[PDB]
Amino acid sequence: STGSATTTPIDSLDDAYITPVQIGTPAQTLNLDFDTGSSDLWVFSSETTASEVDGQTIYTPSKSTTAKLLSGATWSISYGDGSSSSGDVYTDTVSVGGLTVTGQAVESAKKVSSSFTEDSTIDGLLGLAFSTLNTVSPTQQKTFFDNAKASLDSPVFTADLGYHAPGTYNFGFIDTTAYTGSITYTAVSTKQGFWEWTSTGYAVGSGTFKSTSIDGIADTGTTLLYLPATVVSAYWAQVSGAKSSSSVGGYVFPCSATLPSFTFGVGSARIVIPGDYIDFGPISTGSSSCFGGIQSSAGIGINIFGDVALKAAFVVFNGATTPTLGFASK
């Protein structure tokens, strides 16, 4: 089997991407944030505290003839931005772009934090990291990909995110028309439950390539590119007037600037992030200070190749017995 679904930016800045997902019988379509940095599929639901729902589409398990309570199971998760959610669990039929998994754990939110409530466009999360990170207790549950894997033509999925445009998530096949040149594959460590890999270095604009190992994760659920402070400083030093603002929460730059590109290494290959991809616009409406798309990972504990990096590439998440990551230009 295979699946193919379009993923769409939630706003003009590509702050996140949503992908339609069919849950239950008859189908209830929710727009979920596909997140290769976590491993829970959770949704706004008929069980979500009413005051914490503001415009989201909800899953109502009582209206699904294939829904079954996963008796006694609960979940609770917190993310890198301090957001959180928790609740109980149903199993139900879940389909993504024509690919169907029966008995998928669908985690129903009883509570969500303010950032989720305020995000009217995101109806929940679909985790695509390794199932070892799944938070369901007392019986840990498998991700949609984990469940689908054996049935797939190939045990892979791909992320093809657009810059200020829709893109594609494919399951079970590699679309050879979707990228240019070749795909460079690189080793993955699953020790922390992430798609963790080691970049071979970086360049700023037309500058020389710096060969240096940068361990990080491929994370579609993180908006920006988070790298060591040394690397981030070298980038922003090439933008006149750019500076780190503790009050704003990171590097800002004059909205009048032209941003340089940023290159990262994948083995001997190179992925070039155009300067425009690194612009996240005025810090507040009308401001002439703009927020940067490359930020320090210093206060995170891990480097994160988020959407800013991934959208510059065609990315293969290879879930073979020995997992690997592939990157191609496009």
Ligand SMILES: N[C@H]1[C@H](O)[C@@H](N2CCC[C@H]2CO)[C@@H]2OC[C@H]1O2
């Ligand atoms: N990386 C996580 C992120 O920190 C969460 N935030 C919650 C509101 C949107 C987003 C802000 O960027 C979201 O859930 C899991 C994943 O994406």
